[PDB]
Amino acid sequence: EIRKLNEKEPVYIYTSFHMIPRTARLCTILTANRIPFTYRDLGTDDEARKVWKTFSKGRSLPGVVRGHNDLIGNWEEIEEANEDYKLRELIYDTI
Amino acid sequence: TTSEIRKLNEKEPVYIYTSFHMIPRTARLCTILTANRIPFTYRDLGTDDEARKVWKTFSKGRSLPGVVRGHNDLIGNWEEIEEANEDYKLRELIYDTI
C-alpha cells in the first residue's frame, strides 16, 4: 500500500560534472520506465538546494527526489537500480 | 474573515487532477505548484471515482488537467492555473477563497 501512496507523489529530477548528459540519461531512464517527472533546477530553486544539501550526504548531482524530500538516489544510483530492473520499486515502494 | 479563510485552506489537501497534451500540461501544473511552494498530490481520474465525479460535476466543460482543493473545490483547469500563475495570484486563488 506504500505503492499507491507514493504513486500520488511527484517525482523530480534534481539538476542545475557531466550535468547535462547525466540529466539527459535520467530523463531517458525515467521515461523508459514510465515514471513521470519534472525538473527542479538547483540554480534557481532554493527549496531544492536545501533538500539536496540536507539529505544528499555528499552525492553529486543530478539526482531523483520523490515528493518534498524523499531523496531516492543520485544519477549513479538511479542507473544501477535501472540496470537491476528495479527502478519503479526503488522510487515507489520505499519508505 | 480572510485570515480565517487562509488558515482553514491551509488545512486542505491540494490535488492535481490528471488522466489533449495531458502529460506536458500536467507537468506544467506540477512545476507551477512546486514553484509556488504549494504541496500537492496526483489523482488519476482513470481509476479514481471521486475525482472523476468531482471533475464531471464542476468542470462545466473544462479540459483536464486541473487543480482541486479538498473534496470538491475546483480551483481551475490547466489554462486558468497558468493564467493565475502568470498574474502572480495563484497562491491567493488557492488559500484566500472560500
Author numbering:
A (entry chain B): 1134 to 1149, 1155 to 1233
B (entry chain A): 1131 to 1149, 1155 to 1233
Paper lines:
Aip5 is found to accelerate the formation of actin filaments in vitro through its C-terminal folded-domain (Aip5-C) and mediates actin cable assembly in cells. Structural studies by X-ray crystallography and biochemical assays have identified that Aip5-C is in a dimeric form, in which the dimer state and a loop region that directly binds to G-actin play essential roles in regulating actin assembly activity.
L1150 in the loop region is highly conserved among multiple pathogenic filamentous fungi homologs. To test the L1150 role in actin filament assembly, we generated a protein mutant Aip5-C-L1150A and additional mutations of the amino acids adjacent to the loop region, single mutants Aip5-C-N1162A and Aip5-C-S1165C, and one triple mutant Aip5-C-3m (L1150A, N1162A, S1165C). Notably, the additional S1165C and N1162A mutations to L1150A (Aip5-C-3m) resulted in complete suppression of the actin assembly activity of Aip5-C. To understand the consequences of the triple mutation, Aip5-C-3m was crystallized, and the structure was determined through molecular replacement using the native Aip5-C structure as the search model. Superposition of protomer A of Aip5-C and Aip5-C-3m structures showed an RMSD of 2.75 Å, which revealed missing electron density for the loop in Aip5-C-3m, indicating increased loop flexibility, whereas the superposition of protomer B showed an RMSD of 1.88 Å, which showed more similar conformations inside the well-folded region of Aip5-C. The Aip5-C-3m still formed a homodimer, however, and displayed significant conformational change when superposed with the native Aip5-C dimer. The hydrophobic contact established between two L1150 sites of Aip5-C promoters is, however, absent in the Aip-5-C-3m dimer. Furthermore, the loop sites in both protomers are far apart, with the heads of α1s pointing in opposite directions. Structural comparisons between Aip5-C and Aip5-C-3m suggest that the flexibility and/or the position of the loop plays a critical role in its actin assembly activities.
